[PDB]
Design an enzyme around this catalytic site. Structure first.
Site, short mmCIF file in Angstrom:
data_model
loop_
_atom_site.label_atom_id
_atom_site.label_comp_id
_atom_site.label_asym_id
_atom_site.label_seq_id
_atom_site.Cartn_x
_atom_site.Cartn_y
_atom_site.Cartn_z
N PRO C 1 46.66 42.38 43.01
CG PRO C 1 45.91 44.62 42.79
CD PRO C 1 45.50 43.23 43.22
CE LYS C 32 42.35 44.89 40.12
NZ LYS C 32 42.25 43.82 39.11
CB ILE C 64 44.62 41.62 36.35
CG1 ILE C 64 45.60 40.47 36.55
CG2 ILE C 64 43.73 41.36 35.16
CD1 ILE C 64 44.96 39.22 37.11
#
EC number: 5.3.2.1
Lengths: 114, 114, 114
Positions: C1, C32, C64
């Protein structure tokens, strides 16, 4: 709406009142209330357009709606006109990326606009 | 095309000729004439990549077409190679966001590219 | 990110440890690992929000996946909370653009994440 201008024109060449002028004109062009318009000008940048370091601008305008072919041509005439008149940047040395944001993808005031 | 690199590498570490090098290499990679390539390098930034502040870069490449899986892999090899060779940034500390713009959403010369 | 914050708050007003704080909080929020979180803070900017030059911030969060209606509301509460507590910016003077990147459109380490 969120309008960002990055330019190699020096800070001293950005006239006083420029952010207000952008806010007012974008409210009228997009139809959005001026309270929702954000503007950001970044001078003194290291950039080139067409390999040339003559005055140029790389910009973006994001909005929740009010983005489309005809509207974007109208915004380009308005914004290139302001950059030429106020920062002396030729319109053919300006790129503006227009993007239509989904309300669920815009955070504001601890939440989103969805 | 529009390529932006934001980095924590200091301005004195950006070699003379770097914008021209990026313009030329992106013209060859995208197949677009160099007159249509815009490049922007922003050094001395306050950023971290993976929780550390060794040299890193956050970049974006926008183009009207010429964006896709294989093309983007080729662009990453080219741009990570240039950032490693010229700015000494490890390729594993580089993010590049690729975006395909519609011609009607790119303002230039008082209108759009539609 | 990738999280970017552009603000008119001065550099001296950004607390030491802010990038680390954002990295850890975004890793927890997106799920993440912190090794894949990039953060970028740009103070001292010439910007206005609603025509006003009171403290404001224009930000973006790209990932993503992990982008959606409910997730974005949660991110907005988190990030507006941090900007209010650490930079003294009112949440109603913050815009955050959330964008979901396809893995093939993210360059990293000489290739893409596809």
């Amino acid at each position: 709406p969120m309008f960002i201008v990055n330019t190699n024109v020096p800070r001293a060449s950005v006239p006083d009142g420029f952010l207000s002028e952008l806010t007012q004109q974008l409210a009228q062009a997009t139809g959005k209330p001026p309270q929702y318009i954000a503007v950001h000008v970044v001078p003194d940048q290291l950039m080139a357009f067409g390999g040339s370091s003559e005055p140029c601008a790389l910009c973006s305008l994001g909005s929740i709606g009010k983005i489309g072919g005809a509207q974007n041509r109208s915004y380009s005439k308005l914004l290139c006109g302001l950059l030429a008149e106020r920062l002396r940047i030729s319109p053919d040395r300006v790129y503006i990326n227009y993007y239509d944001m989904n309300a669920a993808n815009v955070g504001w005031n601890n939440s989103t606009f969805a």
